[PDB]
Amino acid sequence: YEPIFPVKRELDLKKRIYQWSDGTDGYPPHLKVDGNDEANLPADERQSKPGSARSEGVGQIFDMQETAFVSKIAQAVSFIIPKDIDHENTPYKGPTLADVEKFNKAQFPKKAADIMKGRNIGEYDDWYSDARFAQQHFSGVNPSTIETASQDKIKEYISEAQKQGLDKVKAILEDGKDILIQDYSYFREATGATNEQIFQNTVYELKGTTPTGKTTSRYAAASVVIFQLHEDGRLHPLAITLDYKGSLDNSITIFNRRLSPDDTCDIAEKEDWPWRYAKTVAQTADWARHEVATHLVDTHMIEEAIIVATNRIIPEGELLYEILSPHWFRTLSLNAAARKLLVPGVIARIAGFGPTSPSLDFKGNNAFKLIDWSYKNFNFQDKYIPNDLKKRGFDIKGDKSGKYKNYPYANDMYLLWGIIRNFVKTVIESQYTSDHVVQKDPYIGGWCKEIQTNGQIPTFPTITTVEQLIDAVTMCIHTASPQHTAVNYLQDYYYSFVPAKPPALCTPLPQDLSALQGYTEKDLTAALPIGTEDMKWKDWLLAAQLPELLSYKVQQDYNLITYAKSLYNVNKNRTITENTKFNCKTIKKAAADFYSHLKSAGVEFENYSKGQTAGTVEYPVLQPETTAISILI
């Protein structure tokens, strides 16, 4: 008969089922899906009704009703709100901030049921405040990109401070008492736009398929926020560059009229319309870097690359496949729905990068140029939590000062990284006993080469040592589960109230410093998507509904805990400690530990949360009970 080679037959089959994209769609490498149509996914990785065997599907990922609703908004291309979606009162109707804030609180119940259960930052009256704004850079949806300010970047702000004759603010930077930066000036470099070109998205009105002359513009800014970190451990915003353009000579850079959190000035924080605008512009900058870079690229897309490469090279039954496999549950169908609807029909629509909405060529669209560049400029090893916290300038290993008490991400993760490495170290070493044993493995070398080339993650290691294999496996797990968890499952809260953190601006920037300095509420109210005017209704809905959709809380069984308890691979409907091949006494002992380590950690993440400055919003996101096995939303 014809000769049968079980392995090479199975891999030949997987390399047909799991194929790469040619990249003509304008996305980083992913699983090839003809027109991203559900049907053209691999049979098992498709979607069934909720309460089904895993050989059928993965259960309805999103909330049926709020998908049909969000799809309704994306499809709605008419500038006149459709009869269906329209209501007597809406959270964008206003027409004032007061009226919009007043609506928000009246939608808190006792339907909207996530990890904050229908609640948002709108609960806090003083969300505008310097503490709550800045606190989002430690505890918000993007806690992982703030870093120590380069000495020669302080040198710029020392100069601009002097230029404005602000003698007080100069002395603060002069010495350099824990001066930190959050830098979105890279958006230009990232989109190939010149320093004379402004970010503008021209939203063309269509009569279904055919356009009418009518348009409305949304705007975006390569902002740069400068913070000082005090000893009591409060992150204080000092300065915002609204849109950085090579130098601060060519940009308009405002300074906080209160130079500390306790500072008192006769103009309040609520009435400081110049500063409340700047912060709102700096919020659009972080919305982008969060959704594109920190969320979509760094988690969803990096994980898909691993999934595809791992499936193509490493066979089902191999140890590496079995530890990684569970952390992929339903990731592929979700990215196929992101690439189809969410990225083009929402992200690229509500963002201010443009150049147009809708787009006919995504390779020409800037949101896609940013998606592409974010993937290209990711670094697999540098975002190892230890290496992450080190290079960004955070010594969590030994801070006696207690200055990082307001930074629970940095606290929670430094612990949680070692714990997941502990687990992997025990399981990997149960087969991979030496650097040599790794070197003489068939798949690990080709696994790396596949990821470094086709996956287009060159920063992925050439795995020689046992430590190198452990960190790589930790990272795949860390990215897929707790890192995605942190950045995914606080969207509803921080985005639901659109003014707190809006996706883009609905009016051009102020022309110069002198113009901004005399800004009224109506300017911000206009800049935000409020009123029946200029299709601002659609921008609000999408801005506050995508968060609620993607914040929809994880099911009990898709916990990191429930896995650590029983090692049950939800994704593959099997258990690793039922493969007589592997040294299972060890694996059961690693899992037994890993579980006791996580229960123990949930206690510490709690302490870190309540250990923050009085009033500071909680950080419950990395609670193992509320952490996802995979990138499953």
From the annotation, which residues make up the binding site? Answer: 295, 300, 484, 488, 633
Q: CA angle, corner 420, sides to 418 and 425, nearest 5?
A: 85
Specify the DSSP element, H or E, that contains 241: strand 235-241
E strands in 474-622? 568-569, 574-575
Exposure string over 138-151, b if 16+ CB within 10 A, otherwise e: bbbbbbbbbebbee
Q: Which is nearer to Fe ion, 225 or 302 (CB)?
A: 302
Distance, CA of 236 to CA of 397 (rounded, Å): 23
Minimum separation from the CB atom of position 47 to Fe ion (A): 16
Contacts of 52 (CB under 8 A, 6+ apart): 59
Stretch of 234-242, 488-496, 526-534, 568-576 contacting Fe ion, by CB under 5 A: 488-496
Minimum separation from the CB atom of position 338 to Fe ion (A): 8
Stretch of 55-63, 131-139, 403-411, 483-491 contacting Fe ion, by CB under 5 A: 483-491
Contacts of 118 (CB under 8 A, 6+ apart): 107, 108, 109, 111, 112, 492
3-state secondary structure of 536: helix
Stretch of 279-287, 375-383, 482-490, 614-622 contacting Fe ion, by CB under 5 A: 482-490
Q: Which is nearer to Fe ion, 144 or 488 (CB)?
A: 488
Q: Which is nearer to Fe ion, 419 or 480 (CB)?
A: 480
Q: Are 552 and 306 in contact (CB under 8 A)?
A: no
Stretch of 183-191, 308-316, 481-489, 532-540 contacting Fe ion, by CB under 5 A: 481-489
Minimum separation from the CB atom of position 293 to Fe ion (A): 13
Q: Which of 223, 488, 569, 616 binds Fe ion (CB under 5 A)?
A: 488
3-state secondary structure string, 111-154? CCCCCCCCCCHHHCHHHCCHHHHHHHHHHCCCCCCCEECCHHHH
Q: Which is nearer to Fe ion, 179 or 550 (CB)?
A: 550
Scan residues 304-323 and list those touching Fe ion (CB under 5 A): none
Q: Which residue is nearest to Fe ion (CB)?
A: 488
Minimum separation from the CB atom of position 290 to Fe ion (A): 11
Minimum separation from the CB atom of position 205 to Fe ion (A): 31
Minimum separation from the CB atom of position 326 to Fe ion (A): 17
Q: Which is nearer to Fe ion, 482 or 529 (CB)?
A: 482
Q: Where do we find the tokens 């014809």?
A: 2
Stretch of 59-67, 182-190, 487-495, 579-587 contacting Fe ion, by CB under 5 A: 487-495
Q: Where do we find the tokens 């699983």?
A: 31
Distance, CA of 513 to CA of 242 (rounded, Å): 10
- The size of the interface with Fe ion (CB under 5 A), counted in residues, is 1
Minimum separation from the CB atom of position 492 to Fe ion (A): 12
Stretch of 243-251, 316-324, 355-363, 484-492 contacting Fe ion, by CB under 5 A: 484-492
Q: Which is nearer to Fe ion, 426 or 481 (CB)?
A: 481
Minimum separation from the CB atom of position 628 to Fe ion (A): 9
Q: Which is nearer to Fe ion, 41 or 61 (CB)?
A: 61
Scan residues 229-268 and list those touching Fe ion (CB under 5 A): none
Cα-trace Rg, the chain: 25
Dmax (CA) of the chain: 91
Q: Which is nearer to Fe ion, 149 or 542 (CB)?
A: 542
Distance, CA of 59 to CA of 49 (rounded, Å): 5
Which chain residues interact with Fe ion by CB under 5 A?
A: 488
